[PDB]
Design a protein around this nucleic acid. Structure first.
Ligand code: K
Ligand code: K
Ligand code: K
Ligand code: K
Ligand code: K
Ligand code: K
Ligand code: K
Ligand code: K
Ligand code: K
Ligand code: K
Ligand code: K
Ligand code: MG
Ligand code: MG
Ligand code: MG
Ligand code: MG
Ligand code: MG
Ligand code: MG
Ligand code: MG
Ligand code: MG
Ligand code: MG
Ligand code: MG
Ligand code: MG
Ligand code: MG
Ligand code: MG
Ligand code: MG
Ligand code: MG
Ligand code: MG
Ligand code: MG
Ligand code: MG
Ligand code: MG
Ligand code: MG
Ligand code: MG
Ligand code: MG
Ligand code: MG
Ligand code: MG
Ligand code: MG
Ligand code: MG
Ligand code: MG
Ligand code: MG
Ligand code: MG
Ligand code: MG
Ligand code: MG
Ligand code: MG
Ligand code: MG
Ligand code: MG
Ligand code: MG
Ligand code: MG
Ligand code: MG
Ligand code: MG
Ligand code: MG
Ligand code: MG
Ligand code: MG
Ligand code: MG
Ligand code: MG
Ligand code: MG
Ligand code: MG
Ligand code: MG
Ligand code: MG
Ligand code: MG
Ligand code: MG
Ligand code: MG
Ligand code: MG
Ligand code: MG
Ligand code: MG
Lengths: 160, 128, 33, 224
RNA sequence: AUAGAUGAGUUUGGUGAUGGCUCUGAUUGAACACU
RNA sequence: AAGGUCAUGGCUUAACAAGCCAAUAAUUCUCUUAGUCGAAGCUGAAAAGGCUGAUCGACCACAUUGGGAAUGAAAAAAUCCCAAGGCAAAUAGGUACAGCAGUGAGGAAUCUUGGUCAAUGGGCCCACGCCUGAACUGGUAACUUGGAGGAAUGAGACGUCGAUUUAUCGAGUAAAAUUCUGUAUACAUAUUGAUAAUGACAAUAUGUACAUUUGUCUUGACUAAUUACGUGCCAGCAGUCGCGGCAAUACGUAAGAGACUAGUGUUAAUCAUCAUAAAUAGGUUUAAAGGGUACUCAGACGGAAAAAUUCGCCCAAAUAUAGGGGACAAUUUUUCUAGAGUUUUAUGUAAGAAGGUCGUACUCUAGAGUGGAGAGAUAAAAUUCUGUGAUACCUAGGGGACGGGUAAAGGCGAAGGCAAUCUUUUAUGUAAAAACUGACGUCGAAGGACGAAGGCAAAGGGAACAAAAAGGAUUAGAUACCCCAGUAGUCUUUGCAGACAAUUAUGAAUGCCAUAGGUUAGAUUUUUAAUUUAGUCUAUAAAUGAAAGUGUAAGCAUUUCACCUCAAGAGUAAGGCGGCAACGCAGGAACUGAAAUCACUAGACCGUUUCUGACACCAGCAAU
RNA sequence: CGCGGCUCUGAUUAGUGUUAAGUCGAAAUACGGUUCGUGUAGUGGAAGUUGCACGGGACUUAUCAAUGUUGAACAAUACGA
């Protein structure tokens, strides 16, 4: 549920605050959807499903993950590579917007307004560097990827 | 508070602040007429010193209040109809009102030159 | 709350506790216990 | 946060920006520091990032929530098990002084343990037996015990000749008019004499304290 | 409707906070005083 | 089952069944207040903004108050019937201005007892026409808004006026004077509101003519703008902070200066200021604010991989017919094992309870014990004990509670709390391996349960301790602190009671973030010592914080419950509930303030520590 | 007519607010000169004070009788502050 996305956001903040080169997440399709969007937006370096121990650092892309079955699904985890440029984490802040207590949904015209830096609904306008990820019927997208495809949906979190 | 606590009515109006002139603020009136029950003197509190000319007025609404008499020298006394407005004497406790100088029986300061509109003083007309 | 301010509540609670003991008899006559 | 803000990694970025424009608007900027162009193309290296350290030993597979992932691991070699076995069977082999000071770090270039225990550059020590044992136990397929006995016996025959040569070398020297200085057996005893005396003085001076304080314990000062 | 988001005086020996009060803006089916 | 109905529905009826809605207030009742609504009015940058509920439109209700029916297509009446009090009426049976204008009263406060049915609308009428306080128009009020309310030139009248560096600085391009305009407005003409005809009253256009006021506030800072004199904590000013005590830019006067202007100030109110009740969007260690506790009904929230259904969600609206998209959401289905649990006697352990004991000391009794005048108390004493033999030293019996060492930053329980010992009895929790169930979870208003000490009630117990009461001292006085004694009470059993600095001044729970040194109970190992699980504490990093500090959280996030909204009054009053009572729960307003409040910094102080100087002291000599 | 609610008034009586210039003590802040506070039960002109348990928002304010070492001679072309 949305609680896992909320844990994924606070965990990545703590892993970047600690300047960790790697970090693990519970293996769920929802966490994978947000991680693929962060990687697609350029905030993380890699995504790899593995066990409770991180794969070999050097051979990370050519890593061969074993098939996921009911005999090991309980130990699978998503390993994320974190970026740090100019003595600063590239994924500094991950502020959630929709929470377990309330799921915030935005319309296409509200996202068009938030994309240019104007408040709309419970959201606020985006500034230089900030990003916004929306969970739509076309997958987890960035607010500028959503307005291009002309869809709304559930707002997940704002990435500074 | 949580969304559930707010939905049940946790947000309530803040406790009201007492007005400067409750006898006028309670009924939205700018001024009220009254009869002078007593005309005497009040003593300021610790810092200031002197004798403040005050009057015990019985408003047309029934309330008995203490009003400050602005200016130097007055004409009202017992059984005198005067107009009361808001504003208080800061150093006098219980004096939460002022008397209008151009009122019914209270006269304006005769030898007043500056701020005549505050003391109900007609222009000397010495030029004409 | 500091000890200085708690002593203000300490006196207000003792004065009240002392008032009820004193007027307990007349409150018992008027059926107000 | 008691620590201070160190911006040592951004001296170039900060210095290059301050030199871009002139403080007196309307004039060309002055010449920058002389070091600005020197490190123009030598940026600092990334610091404070915690990577997955080298795993010198296989990590515990049964662990489901492992801790200390960013902690360096202990370096262990197959020889550690062998060194502990030898030096526990030969404790007095640790009394032979060994120089762990390096000369040029090129010791392992002339070590061919297929020949024997005597190599170039290193002395005949318990390490030679461990390296010779490991070679036999890996190449000739011997077992831990078999390879141990072989390299161990070769090591004894060499030590015996070293001790037999000291005695004979001194015995023949005197047969042709050769005399030597004091030996450890004599020097060692003289040092004990000088130290034994210091104890005698302490005991003699410390016993007088007890006998005096003991006799004075009773309050016999009346002198009846 | 994409220009629209602002402060000030006042607690303390002093400093930083907390927290009210007042002023700064707009207005009235208003009243009163001087005009 | 039958009837009725376009059709549906106990809508109606008969016969059977005992259901249906609700459980967190459905339902009912009391008190207080109010016409409701709209970008209708005001207001904010904004929020499903806030406030109001005038003029405008919509809706509701009412026509002195109360109680009613008929007529009619339809009550949609200022109609009708009835009663009561007011006014009028008496042998009558009218009237109620919340229709227009108007009067009296109340009030800080809101206007003409006009003209016309010419225009628009409505009633009656074959038609013509009649009626219309609807309406249109004239009047009153700066209440508000909009507009006008004068432009250009103006140099030596070699004049005046006020300051003053008596010759400088200002009034001052200001005035006078000169040259133009013809604004509101007045008058005249024409057109028009109206056409089949009808003009109450006025608008617009054109021509001619006219140059008409100043007023008010402020002037220490916030806040634009200064001096002189007078006054002397007086008189007074004051929105906030403040000013005034004899050389006041703060009061009063004079002049100047800064502003708005037919208005200007003040009072009252509303929004905003005020993330100052925070849904958007707050907070509770030390400042307002975490419930004494966690098992729990309602409620909120809560895994993995697929599927059905809703079509929630999105395109996406206009309260959108009909469709599309499939991540997510709701109900449901099937699988999975990471959460949560069960089994495998764990170890360790002052959780709890029952029935029995042990011991050190104390205490009483007895032995006309031994001994033979003191003892105990306190800083010192006194009251007090002792020749009826004390204290001291013993022997033999009885009684009641209490729990030495071990002992630790130790442990246990939801908390309160739990420490001698044997047996009996009780739920959790922790470690390692396997096996098992398969989301069965977290939080939790209320109800119920538990809840320290003191206390109430009853029946026991009674050594010791000890509120009360009393005595002796100390003291200026001494309820007191100290002392001789001493009753409740503490203990046992059964109930009541429910308040605590019930504390980590920190609710419970979940995910997560870098180290170091100890310590508690296990586990693994090459059991040396390392590794590891779950606790606890110390000191730090990143960070966080008002800081103190925290850093297994007061960090990053999330869930849920409780609670807070300036001080003071006040956790008080009244009504209510619980209790035998004591008290508990719940919980205001009036009056009065501009401050209360927290952490830190540097000092000073301490009947505070440790030092350093001085005839400061000690000692000695001399002196008053 | 009765019961209930509500409003006003009431001999007598309680509480609290404000008010520099009165009086009686010295309770708190330092070890405040009896540690201070919480609860509960008494007590005293008043602040106070007593019992019982509890909290630190008081004692972490903590700073050696382990008294501190001939830890391998001397001399050489070695060694040389
Ligand atoms: K508090
Ligand atoms: K009328
Ligand atoms: K007409
Ligand atoms: K001040
Ligand atoms: K659909
Ligand atoms: K759908
Ligand atoms: K406790
Ligand atoms: K006693
Ligand atoms: K006494
Ligand atoms: K530990
Ligand atoms: K914080
Ligand atoms: Mg004041
Ligand atoms: Mg003036
Ligand atoms: Mg201070
Ligand atoms: Mg009404
Ligand atoms: Mg009437
Ligand atoms: Mg009147
Ligand atoms: Mg007509
Ligand atoms: Mg006709
Ligand atoms: Mg004209
Ligand atoms: Mg006509
Ligand atoms: Mg100024
Ligand atoms: Mg003035
Ligand atoms: Mg003045
Ligand atoms: Mg005007
Ligand atoms: Mg608590
Ligand atoms: Mg409670
Ligand atoms: Mg409490
Ligand atoms: Mg299954
Ligand atoms: Mg299985
Ligand atoms: Mg489990
Ligand atoms: Mg056991
Ligand atoms: Mg005898
Ligand atoms: Mg005897
Ligand atoms: Mg006993
Ligand atoms: Mg013990
Ligand atoms: Mg436990
Ligand atoms: Mg629970
Ligand atoms: Mg409860
Ligand atoms: Mg009890
Ligand atoms: Mg009891
Ligand atoms: Mg009893
Ligand atoms: Mg007990
Ligand atoms: Mg009970
Ligand atoms: Mg307790
Ligand atoms: Mg709770
Ligand atoms: Mg512990
Ligand atoms: Mg710490
Ligand atoms: Mg209060
Ligand atoms: Mg009260
Ligand atoms: Mg009560
Ligand atoms: Mg309460
Ligand atoms: Mg200090
Ligand atoms: Mg002297
Ligand atoms: Mg002397
Ligand atoms: Mg003399
Ligand atoms: Mg009375
Ligand atoms: Mg005391
Ligand atoms: Mg004292
Ligand atoms: Mg004391
Ligand atoms: Mg006490
Ligand atoms: Mg007594
Ligand atoms: Mg203290
Ligand atoms: Mg301290």
């Amino acid at each position: 549920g949305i609680q896992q996305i909320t844990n994924m956001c606070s965990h990545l903040q703590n892993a970047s605050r600690a300047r960790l080169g790697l970090t693990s997440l519970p293996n769920t399709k929802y966490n994978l959807a947000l991680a693929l969007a962060l990687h697609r937006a350029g905030f993380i370096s890699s995504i790899t499903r593995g066990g409770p121990h991180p794969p070999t650092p050097e051979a990370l892309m050519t890593y061969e993950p074993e098939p996921v079955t009911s005999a090991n699904v309980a130990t699978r985890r998503l390993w994320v590579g974190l970026k740090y440029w100019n003595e600063e984490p590239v994924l500094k802040e991950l502020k959630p917007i929709s929470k377990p207590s309330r799921l915030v949904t935005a319309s296409l015209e509200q996202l068009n307004r938030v994309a240019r830096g104007f408040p709309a609904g419970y959201m606020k306008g985006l500034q230089l560097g900030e990003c916004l990820f929306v969970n739509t019927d076309r997958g987890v997208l960035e607010v500028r990827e959503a307005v291009e495809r002309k869809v709304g949906g559930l707002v997940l979190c704002k990435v500074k | 508070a949580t969304l559930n606590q707010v939905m049940r009515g946790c947000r309530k109006p803040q406790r009201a602040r007492h007005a400067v002139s409750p006898a006028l603020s309670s009924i939205k009136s700018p001024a009220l007429k009254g009869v002078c029950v007593k005309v005497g003197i009040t003593r300021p509190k610790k810092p200031n010193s002197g004798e403040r000319k005050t009057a015990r007025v019985r408003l047309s609404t029934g309330k008995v209040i203490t009003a400050y008499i602005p200016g130097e020298g007055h004409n009202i006394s017992q059984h005198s109809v005067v107009l009361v407005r808001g504003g208080r004497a800061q150093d006098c406790p219980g004096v939460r009102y002022h008397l209008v100088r151009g009122a019914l029986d209270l006269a304006g300061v005769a030898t007043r030159m500056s701020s005549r509109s505050k003391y109900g003083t007609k222009k000397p007309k010495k030029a004409s | 709350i500091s000890v200085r301010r708690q002593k203000k509540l300490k006196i207000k609670k003792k004065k009240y506790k002392k008032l009820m003991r004193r007027t307990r008899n007349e409150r018992r006559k008027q059926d107000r216990l | 946060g008691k620590g201070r803000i160190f911006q040592a990694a951004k001296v170039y970025q900060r210095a290059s920006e301050a030199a871009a424009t002139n403080i007196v608007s309307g004039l060309p900027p002055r010449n920058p520091p002389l070091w600005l162009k020197a490190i123009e193309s030598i940026p600092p290296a990334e610091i404070n990032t915690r990577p997955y350290p080298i795993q010198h030993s296989p990590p515990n597979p049964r662990a489901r929530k492992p801790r200390n992932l960013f902690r360096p691991t202990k370096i262990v070699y197959p020889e550690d098990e062998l060194r502990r076995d030898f030096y526990r069977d030969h404790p007095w082999e640790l009394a032979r002084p060994r120089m762990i000071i390096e000369l040029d770090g090129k010791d392992a270039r002339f070590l061919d343990w297929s020949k024997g225990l005597r190599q170039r550059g290193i002395p005949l020590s318990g390490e030679s037996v461990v390296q010779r044992q490991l070679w036999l136990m890996e190449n000739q397929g011997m077992t831990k015990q078999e390879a141990y006995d072989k390299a161990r016996h070769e090591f004894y025959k060499l030590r015996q000749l070293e001790q037999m040569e000291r005695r004979i070398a001194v015995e023949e020297a005197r047969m042709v008019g050769g005399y030597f200085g004091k030996d450890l057996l004599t020097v060692g005893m003289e040092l004990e004499n000088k130290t034994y005396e210091s104890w005698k003085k302490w005991a003699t001076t410390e016993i007088a304290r007890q006998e005096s304080a003991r006799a004075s314990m009773y309050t016999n000062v009346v002198d009846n």
